[PDB]
Design a protein around this ligand. Sequence first.
Ligand SMILES: *[B@](*)(*)[C][N]C(=O)C1=C(O[C])[C]=[C][C]=C1O[C]
Ligand SMILES: [Mg+2]
Ligand SMILES: [Mg+2]
Length: 466
Amino acid sequence: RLTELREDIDAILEDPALEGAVSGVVVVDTATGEELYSRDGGEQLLPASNMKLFTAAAALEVLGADHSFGTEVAAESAPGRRGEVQDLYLVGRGDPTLSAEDLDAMAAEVAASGVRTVRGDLYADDTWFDSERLVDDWWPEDEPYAYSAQISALTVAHGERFDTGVTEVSVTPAAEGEPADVDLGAAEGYAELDNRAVTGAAGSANTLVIDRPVGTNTIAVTGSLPADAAPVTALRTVDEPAALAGHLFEEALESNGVTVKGDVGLGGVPADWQDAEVLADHTSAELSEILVPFMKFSNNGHAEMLVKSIGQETAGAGTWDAGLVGVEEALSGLGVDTAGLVLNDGSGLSRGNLVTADTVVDLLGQAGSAPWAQTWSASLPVAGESDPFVGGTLANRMRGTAAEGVVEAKTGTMSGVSALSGYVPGPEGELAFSIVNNGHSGPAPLAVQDAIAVRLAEYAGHQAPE
Ligand SMILES: *[B@](*)(*)[C][N]C(=O)C1=C(O[C])[C]=[C][C]=C1O[C]
Ligand SMILES: [Mg+2]
Ligand SMILES: [Mg+2]
């Protein structure tokens, strides 16, 4: 039954949801290298979040499994016996997992080293990366949303999920007629506020909108939230992440008993300082452990940052240009043919990326025998698993099918794009697969993708847990 499997995929692909759509599909046995199936394998397509497959691959190469990202605090000289220090610098180096308690535990160290007073200004130094925040062809109307958060070297991640450059916004109703309450989260007194929202009557029209008007740093809230409505929480992106990190640090410094007499802003370590005094540091977890919340959940902010820290290592420049050449190179050096690949970001958000499916499977093949093979696969969403940090974006897909708990694969989906590629490990040889499609008019053909993935898990020697 190998001819018979082809019959099946051929049929699953005649689906009426793939109308006008160029789908590209490859399936490869790892152990025997035999090509199980190939349809439009060398066609050039937009890979959405599948691009992260390449990014994460090059990130383990250029940076290693053992790489950590540093964050430090700097004055000109040690703190006065009086207590006094001048201008102080919160300086990040591309930690994609920097938290609020992490900031606070840095603010401890500044107090716990003899600082009682900053008489000067507080500066945020995200100069490890350049200040180009968004890729050329990202859509301005997407900017308000998490997947489109601005790129800095020094960005405060939010939550267990380490969503970068963002703020949680809570909107609670009051009584009907009164305007709604609006919590700006971290960005309280950093981000501007326009609150035109209102509490509507009990059980009425919920028409609440949250948006950050393009090219401002105002969170703007409109519409009605009914009085009996369960409180609304929303992640929004703020302008200049690093400056918010500076603000959250001013706040951290104050509660940790350190006065700041000046302002918060952006600015670099003057370089006209000789033996600059580092009075607080912080190391992030290793890359292997950061791969988890990144790949599992498909973190965009993370990928770009990694690209930029790749350009750092190889070239000494957190540039998108620099990094992407670095991503290109690492891949080449890993044995993968980068002919059909066009690189434009690390997250695959941009519609100016291109991958062939043959290339995906190529990379899946290769990464399957690198030293970091085991950390790389640990991070890929596992099909049908309830546990968010395991299921990832495959938590509520393929449950109770041959696929469940078997298929590690990365999703990706945009208007007009979708991909699902990864491994199907079984008794009948390790399996690598790629499913990438564009052109479809309806919803992302997840039913079609799932169907292919499951049938492979069956072929590999698997059965549904019912
Ligand atoms: B890696 C999975 N990510 C995505 O599919 C994705 C979004 O999540 C819903 C949003 C925007 C882009 C995107 O992938 C490119
Ligand atoms: Mg605040
Ligand atoms: Mg099974």
